[PDB]
Curated annotation (Swiss-Prot):
Belongs to the Bunyavirales RNA polymerase family. This is RNA-directed RNA polymerase L. The gene is L. It is found in: Host Golgi apparatus; Host endoplasmic reticulum; Host endoplasmic reticulum-Golgi intermediate compartment; Virion. Coiled coil: none annotated. Classified as His(+) endonuclease since it has a histidine upstream of the active site that coordinates the first cation. The N-terminus contains the endonuclease activity (endoN). The central region contains the RdRp activity. The C-terminus contains the cap-binding region. Homomultimer. Interacts with the glycoprotein N; this interaction allows efficient polymerase packaging into virus particles. Interacts with nucleoprotein N.
Length: 48
């Protein structure tokens, strides 16, 4: 059991390449299979 400072899993430059085939504003991928999604707001509030 050693201890070291956790490395960075995601790089900003990285996901610019990963997202060129994914055109969606709530669905972005920050890794191989994990996604990032903005919470849904249930449309009924679209009148405002």
């Amino acid at each position: 059991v050693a201890e070291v400072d956790g490395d960075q899993r995601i790089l900003i430059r990285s996901l610019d390449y990963l997202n060129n085939d994914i055109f969606s504003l709530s669905r972005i991928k920050v890794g191989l299979d994990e996604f990032a999604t903005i919470k849904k707001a249930h449309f009924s509030k679209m009148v405002s």
